[PDB]
């Protein structure tokens, strides 16, 4: 149970984005139905009044929280991966539009899931803004909590992989468009009952065997991190 509070751009806090530049849902409950319209941008997908200006190459940091800013972030039980996707904003997230910019699942070196490291990072994970066409985008940050993912939601709706989905409105101003954004995957649709990484038993199956759901990270993606960029406590 987690939400996005706001974003940072090059280590500068853009301030509370909830219902302002984040298409915030009404609460921190997960989406679980893989065929739900709610898979796009969570349960209250609509245009919000602001879009954060960035340039290609900026560090864009998402900041998550549980109940209040810079708290426990997400229950430690919620082990799983983190991904970020991008789509042109005129799509409203519909159709074959979502392109993956970032994946982090289980780090064998550190013996930790992405969610475990997100807690340590005070809820912060970042991407480099890609060199796509200037204009308005949706950045879809997705945490998958796997603590009940041994079941398919379609078999037992009390369980299943849990999707914490947050769409941020981002405007890319300066970009040379050296990597034009291709068509991508649909949400809902890209994840199905048979997709690798959706049904996974963290109690019996080693995390060293986990394969995160496709699609693969786009060749145009410039990278990212799970690390505290900004200190919310200094404000
Ligand atoms: O026992 C089932 C699993 O519970 C997980 O805890 C979650 C609770 O089930 C859930 O009711 C609670 O929801 C809170 C939410 O955290 C809070 O932010 C909001 O204000 O109110 C909700 C209640 O209406 O969330 C917790 C997760 O934080 C355990 O984490 C898990 O191990 C356990 O299997
Ligand atoms: Cl939960
Ligand atoms: Cu939860």
UniProtKB/Swiss-Prot annotation:
Gene3D superfamilies: 2.70.50.70. The polyphenol cinnamtannin B1 contained in methanolic extract of Cinnamomum cassia (cinnamon) acts as an inhibitor of catalytic activity. Binds 1 copper ion per subunit. The modification Methylhistidine is found at residue 1. Disulfide bonds join 41-167. Cu(2+) binds at residues 1, 78, 164. Glycans are attached at residues 33, 110. One of its GO terms (molecular function) is monooxygenase activity. O2 binds at residues 147, 162. GO terms for cellular component: extracellular region. Its cofactor is Cu(2+). Keywords: Carbohydrate metabolism, Cellulose degradation, Copper, Disulfide bond, Glycoprotein, Metal-binding, Methylation, Monooxygenase, Oxidoreductase, Polysaccharide degradation, Secreted, Signal. The keyword DNA repair does not apply. Pfam families: AA9. (1,4-beta-D-glucosyl)n binds at residues 9, 47-48, 58, 67, 129, 140. The catalytically essential N-terminal histidine His-1 is post-translationally modified by methylation to prevent protonation of the histidine side chain, and protect the critical active site of the enzyme from oxidative damage. It is found in: Secreted. It catalyses: [(1->4)-beta-D-glucosyl]n+m + reduced acceptor + O2 = 4-dehydro-beta-D-glucosyl-[(1->4)-beta-D-glucosyl]n-1 + [(1->4)-beta-D-glucosyl]m + acceptor + H2O. It comes from the Eukaryota. GO terms for biological process: cellulose catabolic process. Lignocellulose is the most abundant polymeric composite on Earth and is a recalcitrant but promising renewable substrate for industrial biotechnology applications. Together with cellobiose dehydrogenases (CDHs) an enzymatic system capable of oxidative cellulose cleavage is formed, which increases the efficiency of cellulases and put LPMOs at focus of biofuel research. Its EC number is 1.14.99.56. Belongs to the polysaccharide monooxygenase AA9 family. Lytic polysaccharide monooxygenase (LPMO) that depolymerizes crystalline and amorphous polysaccharides via the oxidation of scissile alpha- or beta-(1-4)-glycosidic bonds, yielding C1 or C4 oxidation product. Catalysis by LPMOs requires the reduction of the active-site copper from Cu(II) to Cu(I) by a reducing agent and H(2)O(2) or O(2) as a cosubstrate. Is able to cleave phosphoric acid swollen cellulose (PASC) in the presence of a reducing agent, yielding a range of cellooligosaccharides dominated by cellobiose and cellotriose. This is AA9 family lytic polysaccharide monooxygenase A. It comes from Panus similis.
């Amino acid at each position: 149970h987690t939400l996005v509070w706001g974003v940072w751009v090059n280590g500068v806090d853009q301030g509370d984005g909830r219902n302002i530049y984040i298409r915030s849902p009404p609460n921190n409950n997960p989406v679980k139905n893989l065929t739900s319209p709610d898979m796009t941008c969570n349960v209250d997908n609509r245009v919000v009044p602001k879009s954060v200006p960035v340039n290609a190459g900026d560090t864009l940091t998402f900041e998550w929280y549980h109940n209040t800013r810079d708290d426990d972030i997400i229950a430690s039980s919620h082990h799983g991966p983190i991904a970020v996707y991008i789509a042109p904003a005129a799509s409203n997230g519909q159709g074959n539009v979502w392109v993956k910019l970032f994946e982090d699942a289980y780090n064998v070196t550190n013996s930790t899931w992405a969610v475990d490291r997100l807690i340590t990072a005070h809820g912060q994970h970042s991407v480099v803004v890609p060199h796509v066409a200037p204009g308005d985008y949706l950045f879809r940050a997705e945490i998958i909590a796997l603590h009940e993912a041994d079941s398919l939601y379609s078999q037992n709706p009390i369980r299943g992989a849990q999707f914490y989905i947050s769409c941020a409105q981002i405007t890319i101003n300066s970009s040379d468009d050296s990597t034009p954004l291709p068509a991508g995957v649909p949400f809902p649709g890209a994840y199905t009952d048979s997709t690798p990484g959706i049904q996974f038993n963290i109690y019996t199956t080693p995390a060293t065997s986990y394969v995160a759901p496709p699609p693969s990270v786009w060749s145009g993606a410039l990278g990212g991190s799970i690390a505290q960029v900004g200190d919310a406590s200094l404000e």
